[PDB]
Ligand binder design. Structure first.
Ligand SMILES: COCCNC(=O)N1CCN(C(=O)c2ccc(Cl)o2)CC1
Length: 119
């Protein structure tokens, strides 16, 4: 019932994601010099360094907001990919499965703790 615990749980999970080779494409923003059409396709860039900085700045109120930005990393990869068999997109799908496997308990515990708080 700790309604703050999600923040360190997310820091920990971001540390695991940064250790994961599959996060290599989405640590930093897309260099628009290497992908000159990126912003023609993607309205809202997102990456894991931006998510970590937002968290560490105290600019997430809940793990749902962090989850929305991480999911945007993955949806951007899916929107930008020329092929469902692309290397970078394939890395996104594995990393997404990993993230969803790990974030589920963080969301559940937070929502449970908030419900207890508001009982
Ligand atoms: C080392 O990483 C540098 C920053 N990352 C980066 O440039 N990109 C990651 C995002 N992205 C894609 O999701 C994608 C799908 C299919 C193809 Cl190709 O790319 C475009 C490439």
């Amino acid at each position: 019932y700790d309604i703050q615990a999600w923040k360190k749980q997310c820091e920990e999970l971001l540390n695991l994601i940064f250790q994961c080779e599959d996060s290599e494409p989405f640590r930093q923003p897309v260099d628009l010099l290497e992908y000159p059409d990126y912003r023609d396709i993607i309205d809202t860039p997102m990456d894991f360094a931006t998510v970590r900085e937002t968290l560490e700045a105290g600019n997430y109120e809940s793990p749902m907001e962090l989850c929305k930005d991480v999911r945007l990393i993955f949806s951007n990869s899916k929107a930008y990919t020329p092929s469902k068999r692309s290397r970078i997109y394939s890395m996104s799908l594995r990393l997404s499965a990993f993230f969803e496997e790990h974030i589920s308990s963080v969301l559940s515990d937070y929502k449970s703790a908030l419900r207890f708080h508001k009982r």
